[PDB]
């Protein structure tokens, strides 16, 4: 499934304050009105390409989505960034983690 990204995906290109100005800058942005793949978590957690950068979006009411894994093989053979947000603690690690065939966290 795909949907329309419309005008989402705009971020501050740097940490310089600007006001009342139209500034033209070239960077890695999400193209306007592009197609974004819609994934479901009901009743499906595949591995997606990262390419040159990924735009991510989520809608929450009970904090179902709790982390991200980035890498190439995700099998302890290379370094893979692991980000987990558990209640109030954001944890970032770059260890050579040995991941399960289908990584998940239980309640």
């Amino acid at each position: 499934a795909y949907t329309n990204s419309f005008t989402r995906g705009v971020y501050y290109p740097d940490k310089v304050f600007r006001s009342s100005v139209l500034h033209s800058t070239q960077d890695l942005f999400l193209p306007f009105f592009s197609n974004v793949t819609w994934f479901h978590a009901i009743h499906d957690n595949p591995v997606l390409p990262f390419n040159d950068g990924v735009y991510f979006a989520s809608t929450e009411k009970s904090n179902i989505i709790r982390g991200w894994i980035f890498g190439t093989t995700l099998d302890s053979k290379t370094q893979s960034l692991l980000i987990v947000n558990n209640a109030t603690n954001v944890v970032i690690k770059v260890c050579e983690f040995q991941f399960c065939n289908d990584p998940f966290l239980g309640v």
Partner: protein
């Protein structure tokens, strides 16, 4: 980051990660004080053009100073007293303000002109546009000249300019 300017208070709500602001010209607009987390605007040390209104040195060495597009507030020798005249062109110091209008002599701007008059000094005034002369208009009255004058006027127009020629090779690499 170095520079010269007046540091003033601001109402610009900088984000926690933003440290410097910039203007249209990409110059620094404001900074966050590294010791106290407040945002201070940087306004270049107030400035403006300085023009000298003077009669020729064959007449007098007294001058008036026009500070362009400034208030008579922020303003070695020339002080900020005596005759200070605020105009829409700026703050004029050294010229005496005269209520009487005259024909413009040394133009200042925004309707204000200056001249050297009376013991003599530089005066500033609102320039006259001409004498006021109403027309005795009515629906049954016409004025017809009974006499005339033949006048000769002089109109001078440039036709040519000096036919210069530049040896570019000898000039650059003589």
């Amino acid at each position: 980051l170095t520079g010269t300017g007046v540091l003033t208070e601001s109402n610009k709500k900088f984000l926690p990660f933003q440290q410097f602001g910039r203007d249209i010209a990409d110059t620094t607009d404001a900074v966050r004080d590294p010791q106290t987390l407040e945002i201070l605007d940087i306004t270049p040390c107030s400035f403006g053009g300085v023009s000298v209104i003077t009669p020729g040195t064959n007449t007098s060495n007294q001058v008036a100073v026009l500070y362009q597009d400034v208030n008579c507030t922020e303003v070695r020798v020339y002080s900020t007293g005596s005759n200070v005249f605020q105009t829409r062109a700026g703050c004029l110091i050294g010229a005496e303000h005269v209520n009487n209008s005259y024909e413009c002599d040394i133009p200042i701007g925004a309707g204000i002109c200056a001249s050297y008059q009376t013991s003599q000094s530089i005066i500033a005034y609102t320039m006259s546009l001409g004498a006021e002369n109403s027309v005795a208009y009515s629906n049954n009255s016409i004025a017809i000249p009974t006499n005339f004058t033949i006048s000769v006027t002089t109109e001078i127009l440039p036709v040519s300019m000096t036919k210069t020629s530049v040896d570019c090779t000898m000039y650059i690499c003589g």
